[PDB]
Amino acid sequence: NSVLALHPLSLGQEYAWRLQKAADDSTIFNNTIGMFMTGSIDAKRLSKALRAVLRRHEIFRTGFAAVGNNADATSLAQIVFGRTKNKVQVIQVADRAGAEEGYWQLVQTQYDITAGDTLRLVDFFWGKDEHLFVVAYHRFVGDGSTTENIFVEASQLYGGVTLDKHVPQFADLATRQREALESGQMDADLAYWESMHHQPTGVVSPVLPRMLLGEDGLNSPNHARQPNSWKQHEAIARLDPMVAFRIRERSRKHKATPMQFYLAAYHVLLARLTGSSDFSIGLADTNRTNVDELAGMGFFANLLPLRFRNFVPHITFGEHLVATKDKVREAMQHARVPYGVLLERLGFEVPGATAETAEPAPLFQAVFDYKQGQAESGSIGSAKMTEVIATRERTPYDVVLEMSDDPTKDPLLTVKLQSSVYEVHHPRAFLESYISILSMFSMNPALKLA
């Protein structure tokens, strides 16, 4: 079928392509989100809805092709096809265990991105109107907001809504961002981040120490980082609803947001466990800043590398909360820079997910990713969502805290630690310490940091 247009990779796609190239096996960069739901969904109506979502958005009918014959891989470009090459499936399984098996197969799926095979949209169904609806995506075509948008579009279409004819297409938006960089309009943002991260001429960027969790412990393991293709151990917990309540109250009274409270508390725990007084945390940000960016599909998400440097343990948590609020507000004035272009400017190498190296991530080794959506805004037909299973791509970061704060549930916390550094029980030990520290500070923000 037809090729409509060709485009360069977006800035974010381009850095992601370098990560993928450096990895032994890019299957580790698959993303797979399963939503368990209970209730009637008509297969034909759902599949028609999802087919229309595929047709609407160019990025869901995009392939990614080599430029030249022996770059070898120096350029990839987006090829926008007239019609999608992705498919929708509605699959009968025996029972929930069958559905879960299908899910974990989708986690290992081989995307043929050259051919525009970039998404899986699968409704596994069993029993009395039970479902597991899975959205799986190659890195280049999606992100958490895109997954929300798919559910919401599919729900509305299923329910007979006529979506707007106007669709903000990914390449159009990505080109505007590239032009802003080329034309010098990101230069002030770049200088902000470059100055934040500048070092004395000697001195290597400090990297986060190993956290003392520990496997018990007394007397440090202090062993070499063991190459593991960025395999992560994880643990997940729901936060007590009274702790969440106190956090909302004390955040408001400090003129801060709950996100800033969670981030501040994460920083304090990292400082405690490492003994570092100067390290950075990558703050996840959607990088969607206007109506069209919010409605669009594709890979927009970014990381903002906050440096927490001149650390003072005797200030109160309340004081630290306010200072962290100001740090985030300042960062958000300079949020448009894709972190890979900063990294390149600062001279970093692309990290490799392999069996022969396990180097810390460039610039920052901790990430914080907080989102507040309502899952139920994308409920479909008469099915109600009960539970999400999420398997996002591997990343190089030593410690990652991902949270959902759906205003109609309790906050859900996920901690991921690199297996190259940490043991199988360490994510839970960190998560327990974090919940403790949230409970203590939200009870009494006058307490000192350490």
Curated annotation (Swiss-Prot):
Monacoline K acts as an inhibitor of HMG-CoA reductase involved in cholesterogenesis. Its hypocholesterolemic activity might be useful for lowering cholesterol levels in the blood and reduce artherosclerosis and coronary heart disease. Residues 8-364 are annotated as: Peptide synthetase elongation. Disruption phenotype: Impairs the production of monacoline K. Induction: Expression is controlled by the monacolin K cluster transcription regulator mokH. Nonaketide synthase; part of the gene cluster that mediates the biosynthesis of monakolin K, also known as lovastatin, and which acts as a potent competitive inhibitor of HMG-CoA reductase. Monakolin K biosynthesis is performed in two stages. The first stage is catalyzed by the nonaketide synthase mokA, which belongs to type I polyketide synthases and catalyzes the iterative nine-step formation of the polyketide. This is Lovastatin nonaketide synthase mokA. It comes from Monascus pilosus. The gene is mokA. The chain holds residues 2626 to 3075 of 3075 of the full protein.
